[PDB]
Amino acid sequence: KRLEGKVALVTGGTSGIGLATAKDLAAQGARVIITGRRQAELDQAVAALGQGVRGVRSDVTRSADLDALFETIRATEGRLDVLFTNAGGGSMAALGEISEQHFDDTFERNVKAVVFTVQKALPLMPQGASIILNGSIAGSTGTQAFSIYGASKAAVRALARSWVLDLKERGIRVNVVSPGSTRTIGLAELGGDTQEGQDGLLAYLASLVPIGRLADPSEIAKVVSFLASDDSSFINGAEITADGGQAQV
Amino acid sequence: RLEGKVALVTGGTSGIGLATAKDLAAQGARVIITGRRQAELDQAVAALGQGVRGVRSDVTRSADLDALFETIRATEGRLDVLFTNAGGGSMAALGEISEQHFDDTFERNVKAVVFTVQKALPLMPQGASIILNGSIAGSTGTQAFSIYGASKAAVRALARSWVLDLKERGIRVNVVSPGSTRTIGLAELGGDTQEGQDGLLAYLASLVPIGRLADPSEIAKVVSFLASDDSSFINGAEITADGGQAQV
Amino acid sequence: KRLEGKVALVTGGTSGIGLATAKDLAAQGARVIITGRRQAELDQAVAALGQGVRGVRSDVTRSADLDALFETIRATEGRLDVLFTNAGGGSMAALGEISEQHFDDTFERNVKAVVFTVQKALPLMPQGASIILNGSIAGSTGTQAFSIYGASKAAVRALARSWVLDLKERGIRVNVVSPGSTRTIGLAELGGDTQEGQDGLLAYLASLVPIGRLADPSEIAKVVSFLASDDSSFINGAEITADGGQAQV
Amino acid sequence: KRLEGKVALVTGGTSGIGLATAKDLAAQGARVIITGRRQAELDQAVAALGQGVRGVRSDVTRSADLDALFETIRATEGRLDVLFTNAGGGSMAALGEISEQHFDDTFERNVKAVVFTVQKALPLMPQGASIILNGSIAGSTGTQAFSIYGASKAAVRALARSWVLDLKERGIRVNVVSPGSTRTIGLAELGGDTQEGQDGLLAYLASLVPIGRLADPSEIAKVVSFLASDDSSFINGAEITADGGQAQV
């Protein structure tokens, strides 16, 4: 349909929003490449998705893994139309308890990997290709024990505005999807390892949403597909936020 | 995507409203367009075809609004989608602003938007989508356009509170803010000199970072996306298609 | 005494934030002129303010009242170094219950008055004069049944960004103060005639602020004095929010 | 005198905006401690400021330098009332030319050092202490070849919103100053080594400002002084932008 004939790569495709985005992009008819750190899970994701989804095992923090993955696309498909940098990390640390490792790992995966994934992608990307970055409402709001996560997402959003000018001659457009609270394994885990703890956190976050329900990952994926499509041609550097109104009110 | 959904676009005759109605019809929505002048409306509705229906209407009159929504109730009986595109723009610098240069602009951009939604609301079912006409001028500053820009900023603000008003309804309010889109109105500002319209459009085209005025179809696709159910989790948000002009 | 020797006009000086502001501009030594909804109250406020403050009561919705007040300042002082437009109205109406007059009143008073108060004021204001607009955090956020009030404030803030371009040859600078919840007769009356209604609302609103404390009107005034003072010389078109962090998180 | 009886620390105090802030903070009567990377430059600053300003050479990226410096504050002054994080780095790299070292250096100094500078300070800071972070308009806008610098400054602002909640029990308030273009050696150095190259660049940057003039460093400093002062008591998590209207338009 809309994405017919388009090659799309999603880093952090194995689970959650990346998995749902890969599903939705394939349904629209894109060839989808997804990246996972661990081979067994990546294979399970590729099998479940089907529909011409291809898995490459990679760590976005490792510079060499990025070169290999982009080499596979160039060998297999010959171009990259859509890039969604979904690979991300999050942990709770309040000020006064923040370790050097908690900062570095967060910024390495959430911010540093995004820059180098995008830089390496560009030679493959044609004029009119579309890039989507994984922002969060955490980038614009304040949450206790989430300062490092939110600052990394805010840094991600800003990258888009300056990159608009850098990519201008290329003709590639970069935009940001910022999800509100979305039902995913990662969100549930924050509630703890006990099922009753996961339910409690999920219920509390749902109350915070104005409409009162956590997002389904498919609802986030549709935003990326719209951004991936030619319909988004005039959009550049913009932030599209699906929060149920949480960040808007 | 829009098949089986009733959609009303005010200011349908030209520009984005014309482009928006065309796109919603292509997606399969029942489309009703509002026009100030019948000859423009009748010629517009004929060009659209595709089961497009045209009602003449002036938003600044409650009467014209009341009549139009009664027709929707009789014919379709529910509005799935609402786009308020009817808008006015004039240049007034501080020291040049008339009391009614303000009054006309804020009627049309803001007051007509408030009432159009209020009269539309009873027809709208649970899960319906409302899209408002924001502008990048609402978020930025341009010399002699304070009155236009301030009205659009009010347009954007309405959605945030209207999310809370409409929560029990299940209706969702979102704002589209276009950048410079080629339009008779964008040309109007250059003047009725052929060089004045052309010289202006090239100047605004230089202003956009990509270096091109939007085609109205590019703005239209955004409203349809908000119109579609894919936007189910979007509420109270502003989506801007400016080519990055407001983003940088 | 940074604002010593400066003439300042405050609309809505009689009550709440305008009264506290008038006190603070007077403390630095500015000449302060305040406006009154009604003579009785305006006389009481000037007596409370002392310190050579003069009150002219006029209605901002009326151009003639503006011309009269603007003539008195030029005759009495003949200069307007600092302008604070605090005169404003706020009422609660949910969508589906909003009257034609309620939108018209709120918008005429909060928005229409600002344009005309500022436009007529300008001949008195010298190069380097500072203007402050009355924004609110309600302008950037959404609260149930307050759509018309917030939209009006958003219109106020937008004016400043375009007005900097108009006023550049002027040398006048426009900046916006957006208060968070501040204890005022206007805030309390919202709870109701009953003290309980007033007390219950104030305690509930206090909880919403992250610091958990309702603002004193002087705390908003000190921000207005800072914008009024020469220290704010490089700030232009900006919005400064003293909200207790409410809109920030 | 308003900051009299307040202990203030400014990192990156030796030059430019940090130097001016130290001068203004000292003028209000705060005891001022400044940090410099280079001892010779730091000593000249400490000599010039006078008024009992104390200098500690320190590289904020090094955790040990931070521990040493705060140890001196606890031994000498015994508390820190005001903290302004001015230490910062800026370089130009366009997308497709961004090295890993250019990314790491910017984020270590602009973002990571800020987190740990603030974290180590907290035991010293009493209830009612004020923290100011160095935002930039680059965080809110996009400029070609400045994606990393802008992303780091955007992350700096985001920390404040979450730190509002983290520090609420502490009674400390966190706010961000975001300067527009300010005439400084670093802005000049960036345009060209040559003075002729610098004049055109400074003149060009001046044109971008709506008022049409680059800021003096003292104009930025007054905002930090206001934020340092008790007048900003209700402000929390807010960003104050002194750009001459550049980002506001």
CA angle D215, B242, A117 (to 5 degrees): 85
C-alpha distance from A223 to closest chain B C-alpha (Å) = 7
Q: Rounding to the nearest 10 degrees, give the CA dihedral for residues D4, D5, D10, D13.
A: 50
CA nearest to C140 within chain A: A249
Q: What is the distance between the alpha carbons of residues B46 and C163, in angstroms, rounded to a whole number?
A: 43
Q: What is the distance between the alpha carbons of residues A181 and A187, in angstroms, rounded to a whole number?
A: 8
CB contact at 8 A, A13 and A34: yes
Contact A158 D165 (CB under 8 A): no
Residue C129: both structure tokens together: 């004069």
Q: What is the distance between the alpha carbons of residues A160 and B27, in angstroms, rounded to a whole number?
A: 31
Nearest to B247 among D142, D245, D249 (CB): D142
CB contact at 8 A, C226 and D231: yes
Residue B43's Cβ-count burial label (10 Å; 0-12, 13-18, 19+) is: middle
Residue D125: both structure tokens together: 């800071």
How many inter-chain contacts (B to C, CB under 8 Å) are there? 131
Identify the three-state secondary structure at position D90: coil
Q: Is residue D217 within a helix (H) or strand (E), and if so which, with residue range?
A: helix D217-228
Would you put residue A58 in left (φ > 0), alpha (ψ -120 to 50) or beta?
Answer: beta
Strand ranges in D37-152 using DSSP code E only, listed in sequence order: 54-57, 82-85, 130-134
Q: What is the distance between the alpha carbons of residues D153 and D175, in angstroms, rounded to a whole number?
A: 13
Q: What is the distance between the alpha carbons of residues B21 and A91, in angstroms, rounded to a whole number?
A: 46
CB contact at 8 A, B195 and B26: no
Q: Which residues of C touch A245 (CB under 8 A)?
A: 142
Q: What is the distance between the alpha carbons of residues C135 and C85, in angstroms, rounded to a whole number?
A: 10
Q: Which of C75, C82, C81 is nearest to C56 (CA)?
A: C75
Q: Tell me the residues of chain C between 149 and 168 that have a Cβ less than 8 Å away from chain A.
A: none
CB contact at 8 A, A118 and A131: yes
Q: Which residues of B93-119 are buried (b: 16+ CB within 10 A; e: fewer)?
A: bbeebeeebbbebbbbbbbbbbbbbeb
């929560």: which residue's tokens? Answer: B167
Q: Which of C49, C168, C222 is nearest to C242 (CA)?
A: C222
C-alpha distance from C197 to closest chain D C-alpha (Å) = 25
One-letter amino acid for residue D87 of the chain: A
From first CA to last CA, the distance across chain C in angstroms is 34
Q: What is the distance between the alpha carbons of residues A203 and A205, in angstroms, rounded to a whole number?
A: 6
**Phi then psi dihedrals of residue C132, to 5 deg:** -125, 130
DSSP D8-26: EEEETTTSHHHHHHHHHHH
User: Quick check: B90 contacting D, CB < 8 Å?
Assistant: no
From first CA to last CA, the distance across chain A in angstroms is 35
One-letter amino acid for residue C246 of the chain: Q
CA distances from B225 to B87, C82, C157 (A): 21, 47, 29
Q: What is the distance between the alpha carbons of residues D157 and D139, in angstroms, rounded to a whole number?
A: 8
Q: Rounding to the nearest 10 degrees, give the CA dihedral for residues A95, D33, D128, D223.
A: -100
Strand pairing class (C7-11; D173-179) = unpaired
Neighbouring chains of B at 3+ CB pairs within 8 Å?
Answer: A, C, D
Strand pairing class (D239-242; D82-85) = unpaired
Contact A166 D103 (CB under 8 A): no
Q: How many residues does chain C have?
A: 249
CB contact at 8 A, A132 and A177: yes
Per DSSP, what are the bridge partners of residue C9?
Answer: C33, C83
Helices (H), chain C: 16-27, 39-49, 63-76, 100-107, 113-121, 147-166, 185-191, 195-208, 217-228
Identify the three-state secondary structure at position D197: helix
Residue B247: both structure tokens together: 């983003």
Residue D161: both structure tokens together: 């919103």
Contact C159 B150 (CB under 8 A): yes
One-letter amino acid for residue C226 of the chain: F
Q: What is the distance between the alpha carbons of residues B233 and D6, in angstroms, rounded to a whole number?
A: 49
C-alpha distance from A176 to closest chain C C-alpha (Å) = 20
- For residue B42, the tally of other CB atoms under 10 A from its CB is 14
User: Quick check: A211 contacting C, CB < 8 Å?
Assistant: no
Q: What is the distance between the alpha carbons of residues D150 and D157, in angstroms, rounded to a whole number?
A: 11
Q: What is the distance between the alpha carbons of residues D165 and D173, in angstroms, rounded to a whole number?
A: 9
DSSP one-letter code for D53: -
Q: Which residues of C touch A143 (CB under 8 A)?
A: 249
- Angle, helix C113-121 to helix C63-76, in steps of 10 degrees: 30
DSSP one-letter code for C231: G
**Phi then psi dihedrals of residue D238, to 5 deg:** -85, 160
CB contact at 8 A, D156 and D133: yes
- For residue D207, the tally of other CB atoms under 10 A from its CB is 10
Q: Which residues of B touch D248 (CB under 8 A)?
A: 141
User: Quick check: D148 contacting A, CB < 8 Å?
Assistant: yes
Residues 6+ apart with CB under 8 A from D163: A95, A142, A147, D118, D131, D174, D237
């400002």: which residue's tokens? Answer: D209
Half-sphere exposure of A80 (CA within 13 A, CB side): 28
Q: What is the distance between the alpha carbons of residues B61 and C2, in angstroms, rounded to a whole number?
A: 52
Q: What is the distance between the alpha carbons of residues B148 and B91, in angstroms, rounded to a whole number?
A: 8
CB contact at 8 A, C92 and C146: yes
Q: Which residues of B touch C143 (CB under 8 A)?
A: 161, 164
Catalytic residue among C84, C149, C163, C226: C149
Q: What is the distance between the alpha carbons of residues A178 and A174, in angstroms, rounded to a whole number?
A: 13
Q: What is the distance between the alpha carbons of residues B172 and B128, in angstroms, rounded to a whole number?
A: 6
Residue D194: both structure tokens together: 């040559």
Q: Is residue D105 within a helix (H) or strand (E), and if so which, with residue range?
A: helix D100-107
Contact C141 A249 (CB under 8 A): yes
DSSP chain A: -TTTT-EEEEET-SSHHHHHHHHHHHHTT-EEEEEESSHHHHHHHHHHH-TTEEEEE--TTSHHHHHHHHHHHHHHTS---EEEE---------TTS--HHHHHHHHIIIIIHHHHHHHHHTTTPPTT-EEEEE--GGGTS--TT-HHHHHHHHHHHHHHHHHHHHTTTTT-EEEEEEE-SB--HHHHHHT-SSHHHHHHHHHHHHHHSSSS-PBPHHHHHHHHHHHHSGGGTT--S-EEEESTTTTT-
Q: Which of C99, B242, D141 is nearest to A157 (CA)?
A: D141
CA nearest to B112 within chain C: C100
User: Quick check: B46 contacting C, CB < 8 Å?
Assistant: no
CA distances from C73 to B103, C129, C139, C167, C171 (A): 28, 15, 31, 21, 20
User: Quick check: D237 contacting C, CB < 8 Å?
Assistant: yes
Per DSSP, what are the bridge partners of residue C11?
Answer: C85
Which of A232, A235, A246 has the highest number of chain B CBs within 10 A, making it the mutation to test binding with B?
A235
**Phi then psi dihedrals of residue C230, to 5 deg:** -65, -15
CB contact at 8 A, A165 and D143: yes
Residues 6+ apart with CB under 8 A from B122: none
Half-sphere exposure of D175 (CA within 13 A, CB side): 28
Strand order in the sheet with A130-134: A53-57, A31-36, A7-11, A82-85, A130-134, A173-179, A239-242
Identify the three-state secondary structure at position D175: strand
User: Quick check: A2 contacting B, CB < 8 Å?
Assistant: no
DSSP C172-184: -EEEEEEE-SB--
How far is C-alpha A34 from the chain's CA centre?
11
Q: Which of C183, C182, C153 is nearest to C242 (CA)?
A: C182
CA nearest to D93 within chain A: A166
Residue B114: both structure tokens together: 């408030």
Half-sphere exposure of D49 (CA within 13 A, CB side): 29
Q: Would you call C149 a catalytic residue per the annotation?
A: yes
Is position D204 annotated in a ligand binding site? no
CB contact at 8 A, B53 and B8: no
Is position C14 annotated in a ligand binding site? yes
Q: Which of A49, A59, A57 is nearest to A25 (CA)?
A: A49
CB contact at 8 A, A237 and A157: no
Q: Which residues of B touch C147 (CB under 8 A)?
A: 114, 157-158, 161-162, 165
Q: What is the distance between the alpha carbons of residues C66 and C85, in angstroms, rounded to a whole number?
A: 12
CB contact at 8 A, C177 and C135: yes
CB contact at 8 A, D190 and A193: no
Q: Is residue D160 within a helix (H) or strand (E), and if so which, with residue range?
A: helix D147-166
Nearest to B248 among D142, D245, D248 (CB): D142
Q: What is the distance between the alpha carbons of residues A186 and A189, in angstroms, rounded to a whole number?
A: 5
Experimental method: X-ray
Q: Which of C248, D140, D248 is nearest to A157 (CA)?
A: D140
DSSP chain B: --TT-EEEEETTTSHHHHHHHHHHHHTT-EEEEEESSHHHHHHHHHHH-TTEEEEE--TT-HHHHHHHHHHHHHHTS--SEEEE---------TTS--HHHHHHHHIIIIIHHHHHHHHHGGGPPTT-EEEEE--GGGTS--TT-HHHHHHHHHHHHHHHHHHHHTTTTT-EEEEEEE-SB--HHHHHHH-SSHHHHHHHHHHHHHHSSSS-PBPHHHHHHHHHHHHSGGGTT--S-EEEESTTTTT-
Q: Tell me the residues of chain B between 121 and 140 that have a Cβ less than 8 Å away from chain C.
A: 121, 137-140
Is position C161 annotated in a ligand binding site? no
Farthest-apart Cα atoms in chain C, separation: 52
- Whole-number CA gyration radius for chain A: 17
Q: What is the distance between the alpha carbons of residues A35 and B103, in angstroms, rounded to a whole number?
A: 56
Would you put residue B14 in left (φ > 0), alpha (ψ -120 to 50) or beta?
Answer: beta
How far is C-alpha D149 from the chain's CA centre?
14
CB contact at 8 A, C16 and C84: no
**Which H, E and C letters describe A218-243, residue by residue?**
HHHHHHHHHHHCHHHCCCCCCEEEEC
Catalytic residue among D146, D149, D163, D226: D149
Per DSSP, what are the bridge partners of residue B53?
Answer: B32
Nearest to B235 among A164, A223, A244 (CB): A244
Half-sphere exposure of A238 (CA within 13 A, CB side): 28
How many inter-chain contacts (A to C, CB under 8 Å) are there? 11
Domains detected in chain C:
7-180+215-242 (3.40.50.720)
DSSP one-letter code for D6: -
Residue B196: both structure tokens together: 């004045």
Strand order in the sheet with C239-242: C54-56, C31-35, C7-11, C82-85, C130-134, C173-179, C239-242
C-alpha distance from A143 to closest chain C C-alpha (Å) = 7
Dihedral sign, CA of C167, C173, C179, C185? negative
Half-sphere exposure of B134 (CA within 13 A, CB side): 33
Residue B243: both structure tokens together: 């080519």
Nearest to D211 among C161, C168, C243 (CB): C168
Contact C63 B99 (CB under 8 A): yes
Q: Which residues of B touch A241 (CB under 8 A)?
A: 234, 237
Q: What is the distance between the alpha carbons of residues A241 and A176, in angstroms, rounded to a whole number?
A: 8
Residue D108: both structure tokens together: 């270590």
DSSP C151-213: HHHHHHHHHHHHHHHHTTTTT-EEEEEEE-SB--HHHHHHH-SSHHHHHHHHHHHHHHSTT--
Resolution of this PDB entry, in A?
2.5
Per DSSP, what are the bridge partners of residue B239?
Answer: B176
User: Quick check: B141 contacting D, CB < 8 Å?
Assistant: yes
Residues 6+ apart with CB under 8 A from B95: C119, C122, C166
Q: Which residues of B touch C239 (CB under 8 A)?
A: none
User: Quick check: A236 contacting B, CB < 8 Å?
Assistant: yes
Identify the three-state secondary structure at position C4: coil
Residue A63: both structure tokens together: 């510079």
**Phi then psi dihedrals of residue C216, to 5 deg:** -80, 145
Identify the three-state secondary structure at position C127: coil
Strand pairing class (B172-178; B129-133) = parallel
- Angle, helix A39-49 to helix A16-27, in steps of 10 degrees: 30
Per DSSP, what are the bridge partners of residue D173?
Answer: D130
DSSP one-letter code for D108: I
Q: What is the distance between the alpha carbons of residues B70 and B120, in angstroms, rounded to a whole number?
A: 10
């970072």: which residue's tokens? Answer: B209
Strand pairing class (B52-56; D239-242) = unpaired
